[PDB]
Amino acid sequence: SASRSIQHCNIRCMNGGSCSDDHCLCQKGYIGTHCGQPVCESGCLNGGRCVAPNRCACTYGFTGPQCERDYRTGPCFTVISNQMCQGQLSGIVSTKTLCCATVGRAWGHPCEMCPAQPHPCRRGFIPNIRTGACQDVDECQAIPGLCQGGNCINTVGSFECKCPAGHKLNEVSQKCE
Numbered sequence: 001s002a003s004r005s006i007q008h009c010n011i012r013c014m015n016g017g018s019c020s021d022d023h024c025l026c027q028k029g030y031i032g033t034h035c036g037q038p039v040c041e042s043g044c045l046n047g048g049r050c051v052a053p054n055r056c057a058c059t060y061g062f063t064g065p066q067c068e069r070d071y072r073t074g075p076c077f078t079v080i081s082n083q084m085c086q087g088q089l090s091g092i093v094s095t096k097t098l099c100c101a102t103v104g105r106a107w108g109h110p111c112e113m114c115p116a117q118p119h120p121c122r123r124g125f126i127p128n129i130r131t132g133a134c135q136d137v138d139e140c141q142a143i144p145g146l147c148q149g150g151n152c153i154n155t156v157g158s159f160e161c162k163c164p165a166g167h168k169l170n171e172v173s174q175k176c177e
């Protein structure tokens with residue numbers, strides 16, 4: 001006894017799909033004929049791409065597997081006219097948010113310039129994406145080495161730089177001189 005007849009489906013199944021009847025019986029959260037399209041439940045973000053059910057693949061710089069944490073890495077620029085973005089450069093990675101709310105200069109590429117305090121709280125604060133509460137940043141820690149002097153300490157609303165004697169903190173260029 002022999003037969004060339006296919007004792008099963010005809011189409012092709014991938015992605016946890018059962019190949020029966022004529023169409024693929026898709027894995028949970030998969031759609032399409034061969035079930036190769038995953039359900040982008042909460043919507044893709046940052047121009048990503050759906051790879052699994054609700055698993056969108058996220059481009060760069062979003063923490064949390066649902067990329068709604070749009071923290072891109074960028075150089076924090078400290079002084080901008082049409083002339084320079086700072087003038088001595090710096091691989092200070094922080095968020096634009098940080099650089100705008102606190103320090104109030106610019107950040108990113110190519111040179112994204114912003115006012116200081118954006119939200120009506122206090123420049124040294126960022127509205128918690130959880131509570132909504134304006135929280136002070138350890139600007140010292142949150143804007144890597146922005147203070148060029150001796151010590152850098154933090155109060156809410158502003159950081160405190162400790163300068164050697166004779167020196168004088170200049171918050172225009174966070175410089176003790």
Ligand SMILES: [Ca+2]
Nearest residue numbers: 124136137158
């Ligand atoms: Ca602070």
